[PDB]
Write a protein that binds this DNA or RNA. Structure first.
Ligand code: HEM
Length: 493
RNA sequence: CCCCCCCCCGGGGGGGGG
RNA sequence: CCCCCCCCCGGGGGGGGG
């Protein structure tokens, strides 16, 4: 038996209804399968519930050849009568599109229904996707944590009794692990799926512990009630070592960006002169040590270096810390600005309010008055001059993170906190998915990044590392920038 | 119930890359 | 740790014999 301890913050049996850029769902990574997986810095489509695919010459039609003999979980709440087929695929994508099955933040922010025309079953083992125009990002989005396949047989039985809410309370998937029992925001008890379509899970029983706070997580670990500890307290990390023979640490870089956005609804914030000066006033180097204790990189980029689309070696930032230039342009302007901070646990921010004080301090030195406000996620959904946020993405295709944050389509949404719209940026972004090749795609993505780093719609603060601690007994631990953790590969020695 | 071909999975052996 | 070929096992589909 293995125990995985992590935060109750962001816990869901459905990453589709969850707010985008906030989590990597460690639970749905084990109980649900996608059509494809992408687990390499080359973005190679690993076939999962889809054996293979082919794209029409014009680029507007994708055919998915689905795997045979795949069966859904046999749980107390559901007992399947048939194998996985095209009907389960058709139901799952049509739901997020808003089409006949007979708010999805991620899929809304990438505008899937504007990408996809139709998803239809040709054979029981063949699905046809119609596209409005060629999109080289479609299968990467269907390779993401958000594109899990649900049971059509289960949803038909649930819709029979108005019970379709149960889908997210009592799950049924094709994953290597199966849900046994749980208590909300406390624990999840997983059991190995015996009739899995791939190499079977090595550990029969896994418990996902959500109960303990960030501080007492390493406490529970060293008390041996916890064999893998995820997201530990940042100050506690500097107490640990890599020499120890009873525990090891594993870090990973990726798309985990903390940033500051300018509200472009504020006539002052639409001024490039003040935006470039505010950035010059911020000592982002000093923030990385006080907030992240060497578990982050000062970010002068939006696309991480682990992305296939990082062809720029992140050049020197033209609006980096210089308080003398900042003091001149801002003090004489006599500015007072409302800085909002989302009051929640952030994966890109261990201490978001502490950082908001360090920003309030750095800006006062250059003659800017900042008034920080603790704001809730739904209150924001219902005014700020600056907001402190970020993005965590496993999908390292910049269509999945740069489009939600900076595109015109998402301006009046929670994803684009800048309320920015640049038709030249949208130009590069649209171009980057009409071309199918990585050379062509990375060129347009670096052009858009270069535009973002000069127009300054956001100030990138940190390149954050996801950390975990594991016991020496536990082998088969592989932390990747591409997703959560695969519990299938875990085993004791 | 017995026998071919295709696809997929798992295992073992030979070869190739860090 | 990643990738070829051979062999074996299991599963799914098409074909052939009582
Ligand atoms: C490789 C170098 C290792 C050294 C030098 C080492 C040393 C020790 C020491 C000194 C203790 C007593 C507590 C202490 O004062 O540290 C201990 C206990 C223990 N060690 Fe190790 N250890 C090593 C590797 C491992 C590994 C790989 C495991 C995997 C299980 C392991 C499992 C344990 C366990 C479980 C205990 C507690 C008693 C027990 O469970 O049998 N050790 N070891």
């Amino acid at each position: 038996g293995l125990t995985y301890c992590t935060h109750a913050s962001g816990f869901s049996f459905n990453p589709q209804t969850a707010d985008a850029g906030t989590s990597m769902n460690v639970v749905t990574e084990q109980i649900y399968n996608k059509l494809f997986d992408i687990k390499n810095h080359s973005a190679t489509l690993t076939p999962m519930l889809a054996q293979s695919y082919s794209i029409s010459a014009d680029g507007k039609e994708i055919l998915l050849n689905l795997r045979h003999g795949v069966k859904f979980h046999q749980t107390p709440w559901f007992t399947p009568t048939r194998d996985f087929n095209a009907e389960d695929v058709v139901f799952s994508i049509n739901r997020v599109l808003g089409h006949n099955t007979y708010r999805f933040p991620y899929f809304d922010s990438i505008k899937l229904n504007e990408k996809i025309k139709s998803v239809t079953a040709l054979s029981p083992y063949q699905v046809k996707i119609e596209l409005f125009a060629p999109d080289s990002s479609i299968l990467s989005h269907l390779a993401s944590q958000y594109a899990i396949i649900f049971s059509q047989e289960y949803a038909y039985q649930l819709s029979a009794d108005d019970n379709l809410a149960q889908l997210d309370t009592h799950p049924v998937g094709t994953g290597p692990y199966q849900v046994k029992d749980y208590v909300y925001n406390q624990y999840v008890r997983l059991v190995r799926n015996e009739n899995y379509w791939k190499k079977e899970a090595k550990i029969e029983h896994i418990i996902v512990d959500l109960s303990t706070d960030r501080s007492g997580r390493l406490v529970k670990f060293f008390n041996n009630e916890c064999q893998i500890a995820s997201y530990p307290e940042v100050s506690q990390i500097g107490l640990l070592k890599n020499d120890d023979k009873h525990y090891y640490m594993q870090s990973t870089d990726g798309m985990n960006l903390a940033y500051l956005a300018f509200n472009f609804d504020k006539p002052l914030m639409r001024d490039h002169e003040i935006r470039a000066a505010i950035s010059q006033s911020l000592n982002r180097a000093r923030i990385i040590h006080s907030i992240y204790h060497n578990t982050a990189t000062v970010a002068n980029n939006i696309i991480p270096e682990v992305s296939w689309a990082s062809t720029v070696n992140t050049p020197e930032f033209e609006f980096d810390y210089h308080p003398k230039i900042a003091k001149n342009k801002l003090a004489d302007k006599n500015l007072l600005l409302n800085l909002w901070v989302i009051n929640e646990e952030q994966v890109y921010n261990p201490a978001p309010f502490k950082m908001a004080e360090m920003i309030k301090w750095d800006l006062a030195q250059a003659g800017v008055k900042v008034k920080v406000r603790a704001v809730t996620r739904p209150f924001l959904t219902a005014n700020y001059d600056l907001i402190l946020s970020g993005w965590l993405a496993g999908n390292l295709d910049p269509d999945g993170f740069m489009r939600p944050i900076l595109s015109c389509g998402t301006k009046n949404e929670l994803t684009n906190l800048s309320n920015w719209c640049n038709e030249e940026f949208d130009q590069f972004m649209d171009r980057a998915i009409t071309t199918s090749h990585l050379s062509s795609r990375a060129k347009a993505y670096n052009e858009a990044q270069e535009l973002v780093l000069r127009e300054l719609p956001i100030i990138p603060i940190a390149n954050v590392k996801r950390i975990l601690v594991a016991n020496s007994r536990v082998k088969g631990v592989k932390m990747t920038p591409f997703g959560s953790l695969d519990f299938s590969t875990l085993y004791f020695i």
